[PDB]
Design a protein around this ligand. Sequence first.
Ligand SMILES: CC(C)CCC[C@@H](C)[C@H]1CC[C@H]2[C@@H]3CC=C4C[C@@H](OC(=O)CCC(=O)O)CC[C@]4(C)[C@H]3CC[C@]12C
Lengths: 127, 350, 105
Amino acid sequence: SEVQLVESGGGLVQPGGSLRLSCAASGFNVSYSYIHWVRQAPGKGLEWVASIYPYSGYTSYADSVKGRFTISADTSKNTAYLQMNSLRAEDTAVYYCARYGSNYSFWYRGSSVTYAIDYWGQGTLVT
Amino acid sequence: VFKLIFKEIKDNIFIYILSIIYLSVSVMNTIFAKRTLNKIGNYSFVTSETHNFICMIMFFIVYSLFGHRSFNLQFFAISMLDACSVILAFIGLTRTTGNIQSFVLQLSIPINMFFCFLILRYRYHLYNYLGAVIIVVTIALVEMKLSFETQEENSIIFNLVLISSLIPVCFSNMTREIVFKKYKIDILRLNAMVSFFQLFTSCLILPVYTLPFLKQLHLPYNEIWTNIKNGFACLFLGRNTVVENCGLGMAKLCDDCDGAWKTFALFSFFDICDNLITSYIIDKFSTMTYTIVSCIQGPALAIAYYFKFLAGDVVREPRLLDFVTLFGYLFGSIIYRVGNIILERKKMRN
Amino acid sequence: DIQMTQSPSSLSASVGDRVTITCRASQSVSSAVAWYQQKPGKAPKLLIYSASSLYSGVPSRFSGSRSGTDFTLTISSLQPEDFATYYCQQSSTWPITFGQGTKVE
Ligand SMILES: CC(C)CCC[C@@H](C)[C@H]1CC[C@H]2[C@@H]3CC=C4C[C@@H](OC(=O)CCC(=O)O)CC[C@]4(C)[C@H]3CC[C@]12C
C-alpha cells in the first residue's frame, strides 16, 4: 500500500572488490518508473551513481563509475540490484535507492512527462 | 532567373495562406489543449466527449446556415478509424519522448505517401521522394540525437503503436478525400455526422483506461462512472473533486476548474477550425498536401514554446537544432511542391 | 554535461526571515528541475518539482520560480524545522547533477 524502498548489502568491503546492494520496493510497481541509486560521501553533496528503467531494461551510469558498476532489476520479485566492482577508497558513502515520481501532462496529440525523486530509502553505508 | 517565384505564388496563393491559417490554428489548439488538460488532467474522456458534442451541434448550425442513398456508413467508418487512431495514440504516448512524437509525425508523411499510392492511385515524381527522404532523414537524425540525451522514458513498442495510430488516421483522411472528391458530399454534414459517431466511439474508447500501465489516468472498472460525473461537476460548474494528496508520483492529477470552461471553449473552437480547414484542404487540393501542412506543426510547436505568452512559464531557448528541423522541413516541402509543379505541368502539357 | 551552480553555499537566517536559494544551470534546462531538503542524518525530502509546484505534503511557505536557467527557491517565513541543506536537481539531460548544497542556519 504505502511506498517503501529498503536496501541491503551495505557494510565493509576491502578496496578493490565486489559488493551487491539490493533495494526492495513496496507498494508501487517497479516496471512503471525509473529507479536510481544516489550516493553522498561524508560531508559532501549528493552524487548520482546509476539509473534503470526496468521495463525497457534501459541502464545509465555516471561518468566516474561507468564500466565498473552494474545496475539491474528483477521485476518478478519487484526489487533492484546494484553491483559495484573494482571499488576504490573514494566510493565510500551512504547510498540511497530512489524512484522517479512522474507527472503525466497529456494533450490529445502528445504527452510530456516530468520527473522528481519522490521516495528515498533510508540509506546504506559503504566503506 | 529568380523572378519566377512571384508568378508561381500568384498562380496558386490559396494553399500557402491556408497553410498559414492551419499553422496558427493547430499550434493554438495544441497549446490550449495542454493548458486545459493541465487544469483538468483527469476527466480527459469527458473533455473530449463534450468537445465532440459541441463540435457536432456547431457544425450542424453552420451547415444549416451556409450549406448509394446516404453516407452514414462511410461517416461511421471515418469516425471509427479516428477513434482507433486516438486509442493507439493514447496508449503509445505513455512511454514516448517529446522528440519521437515529432519524428512520428514525419513518419506519418511516408505512410500517407504509400497508402495514397496504393489505394487511390497517386503518381509521384523524383523530387517528391527526394523531399520526403530529406525531411524525414533530417528530423529523424536530430530528434533521435535529442532522445539519446533526454531522461524521458521510452519503449520501442509504444512508439510502434504510435505509428499504428498514424495508420488509421491516414485511412480516414484518404477516405474522406474519396467521399469528397467522388460523391461531392459537403464538408459540414460530414463533420457533423463524424462527430456524432465520434461521441459513440469515444464512449467505446472508455474501456482503455482500465489497463494499469497508465501513470495517472488509470481508472478501474468501479470508478469510471464517478469520474464522468465528477468531470461534469468540474467543467460545467467549477467544483474541484481532488485537492488532497495529489500530483507528481501520485494517483491523480490535481485539478482547478473555477474558470476552466473558458480555456476548454477556446480549445474546442480551435479544434473545430482545425478539423474544418483540414477537410477543406482535403476536398480542395489533396490528402497529400494536408499531411505536409500537418507536419508543419512539429517544428512550429518548438518555435512557439520559446515565448512565455504562448507556453505559460515553461519555455525553452532557441537551440540551432530546432531551427534546422524547421529549415529541413521548409526545404523538403519546397522541393516537394516543386515536384508537384513539374508533375502538373507534364500533365497539363499533354 | 550540465552542472547546477547553487547560489550561496550557506546562508545565516533567523526565524521569520525570507530566504532565497538560487541555482543556475549551465545551459538551457526547461522548467524540469526539482528541489530537495536534507536534514543532517536523514534522507532528502522532495520539496518542489518542475521549479514551480509544491509536492503533496509540503507546507505553503516554499515556492519555486525561474527566469531562463536561474531557478530560485524561496521561503516566506522560516521556522525551526526549515533548518537543513537544500539541493536542486535537473531532469533534462541524462548526466544527473545535483547542486552542491545550501545550509541554512
Ligand atoms: C512569416 C511566415 C509565417 C510566412 C512565410 C512562411 C511560409 C512561406 C512557409 C511556412 C510553411 C510553408 C508551407 C508548408 C507546406 C506547404 C504545402 C505544400 O504543398 C505541397 O506539397 C503540394 C501542394 C499542391 O500544390 O497541391 C507546398 C509548400 C507549402 C505551401 C509551404 C510553402 C512555404 C510555407 C508557407
